[PDB]
Design a protein around this ligand. Structure first.
Ligand SMILES: CC(=O)N1CCN(c2ccc3c(NCCN)nc(C4(c5ccc(Cl)cc5)CCCCC4)nc3c2)CC1
Ligand SMILES: CC(=O)N1CCN(c2ccc3c(NCCN)nc(C4(c5ccc(Cl)cc5)CCCCC4)nc3c2)CC1
Length: 300
C-alpha cells in the first residue's frame, strides 16, 4: 500500500466526503458528501470537476452502472431516501426509492435495482421504475441491524437478512443461522460461496467451509477481478473504525491489516484493481464539522 494521492473537498472550511466509487473514466472518482452532494474529482490533483445536489441529507452510498449511464445514491434522512440518476448528457433523476436506505444494481445484466428497507428487499425494473418483487418472510427474518439486500453474480439469487431467495420463483430457499447482530452477508463473485460475518458457507451444500475471525463486524467489498476481499469493521458518527483488512478471495488467508489511525467512511478500487481509495476522517465524532480526506493507495 503506497500512498499516491490525498485530497479534501474543495474550498470548505470542513471536508464532507462520506463515500466514493470510481466512474468509467479512470482518473475520476465520484464522492458523496454530508450535504448530499455528488462530486467528481481528479484523484491525482484533487481538482473538483463537477457537483450535483442529490439529497438534502448526507450520502451513505453510491454505485455507478458499468456502462457509465446511471447512478444509485442512498442518503441518511431524506424522502426519498435512495434514487437512480441518469448521467448521459444531463444529470437528472430517473426514479426514487422512497424508504430504501440501501440500493444496488443487478450484476450480470444491469436492468434491475434491489433496495433494502429494514428487513425487507424490493426489486425494481430500471426502465419503468416499477416494484417487481417484495422479499420478506417474518418467520425467517434475522433482523440484522445493518441488513443490506444483494443479488448474486447471475442475478437469480438474493441474500436478504440472512435468507437466500430464488428470484425466478420468489421463494426462500434457506435461512442461514444468526451468529451476530449486524452483518447480513454478501455473495462471493465465484457464485458458489456466501460470506456472512465470520462464516463462509457453500451455496451448493450449505456446509461451513471457513471461519474468518478477522472478518467479524466487517462490510466486505471485492476487487473487480474477484481475487481480493477488503473489510472495514463497524465501531462500538462513521459506521467504521480506523483499520481495514485484506484477504485472498480464493483461500481467505489474511494478506494485510492497515490501521490508518482515522475512522473510515468508505473504500473502493478502480476497475483495473491498481488503486484503493479510502475516505478517512481526521476529526473525531465529537467535532463540530466532519473533516474527511480521500486517500489513494497503489496496492502492495
Ligand atoms: C479531460 C477529462 O477527461 N475530463 C475533464 C473533466 N471531466 C468532466 C468535466 C465536467 C463534467 C460536467 N460538468 C459540465 C456541465 N455541468 N458534468 C458531467 C456529468 C456530471 C457528472 C457528475 C456530476 Cl456530480 C455532475 C455532472 C456526466 C456526463 C454528462 C452529464 C453531466 N461530467 C463532467 C466530467 C471528466 C473528464
Ligand atoms: C448522520 C450522518 O450524517 N452520517 C454521515 C454518513 N454516514 C455514513 C457514511 C458512510 C456509510 C457507508 N459507507 C460504505 C458504503 N458506501 N456505508 C453505510 C451502510 C453500511 C454501514 C455498515 C455496514 Cl456493516 C453495512 C452498511 C451501507 C450504505 C447504506 C447505509 C449503511 N453507511 C454509511 C453511513 C452515516 C452518518
Amino acid at each position: 500500500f503506497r500512498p499516491i494521492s490525498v485530497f479534501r473537498e474543495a474550498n470548505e472550511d470542513e471536508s464532507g466526503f462520506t463515500c466514493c466509487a470510481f466512474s468509467a473514466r479512470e482518473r475520476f472518482l465520484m464522492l458523496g458528501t454530508c450535504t448530499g452532494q455528488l462530486k467528481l474529482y481528479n484523484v491525482f490533483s484533487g481538482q473538483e470537476e463537477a457537483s450535483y445536489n442529490c439529497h438534502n441529507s448526507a450520502i451513505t452510498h453510491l454505485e455507478p452502472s458499468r456502462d457509465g449511464s446511471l447512478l444509485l445514491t442512498s442518503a441518511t434522512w431524506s424522502q426519498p431516501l435512495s434514487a437512480l440518476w441518469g448521467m448521459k448528457s444531463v444529470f437528472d433523476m430517473k426514479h426514487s426509492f422512497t424508504e430504501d436506505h440501501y440500493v444496488e444494481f443487478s450484476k450480470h445484466s444491469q436492468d434491475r435495482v434491489i433496495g433494502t428497507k429494514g428487513d425487507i428487499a424490493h426489486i425494481y425494473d430500471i426502465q419503468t421504475g416499477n416494484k417487481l418483487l417484495t422479499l420478506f418472510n417474518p418467520d425467517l427474518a434475522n433482523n440484522y441491524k445493518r441488513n443490506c439486500a444483494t443479488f448474486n453474480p447471475t442475478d437469480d439469487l438474493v441474500l436478504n437478512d440472512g435468507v437466500l431467495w430464488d428470484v425466478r420463483s420468489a421463494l426462500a430457499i434457506h435461512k442461514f443461522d444468526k451468529f451476530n447482530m449486524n452483518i447480513s452477508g454478501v455473495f462471493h463473485p465465484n457464485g458458489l460461496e456466501v460470506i456472512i460475518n465470520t462464516e463462509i458457507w457453500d451455496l451448493r451444500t450449505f456446509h461451513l467451509l471457513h471461519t474468518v475471525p478477522a472478518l467479524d463486524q466487517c462490510r466486505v467489498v471485492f476487487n473487480h477481478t474477484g481475487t481480493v476481499m477488503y473489510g472495514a469493521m463497524l465501531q462500538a458518527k462513521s459506521p467504521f473504525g480506523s483499520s481495514f483488512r485484506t484477504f485472498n478471495a480464493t483461500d481467505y488467508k489474511p494478506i494485510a491489516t492497515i490501521d490508518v489511525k482515522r475512522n473510515i467512511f468508505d473504500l473502493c478500487t478502480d476497475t483495473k484493481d491498481c488503486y484503493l481509495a479510502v475516505i478517512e476522517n481526521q476529526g473525531s465524532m465529537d467535532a463540530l464539522n466532519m473533516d474527511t480526506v480521500c486517500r489513494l493507495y497503489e496496492v502492495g
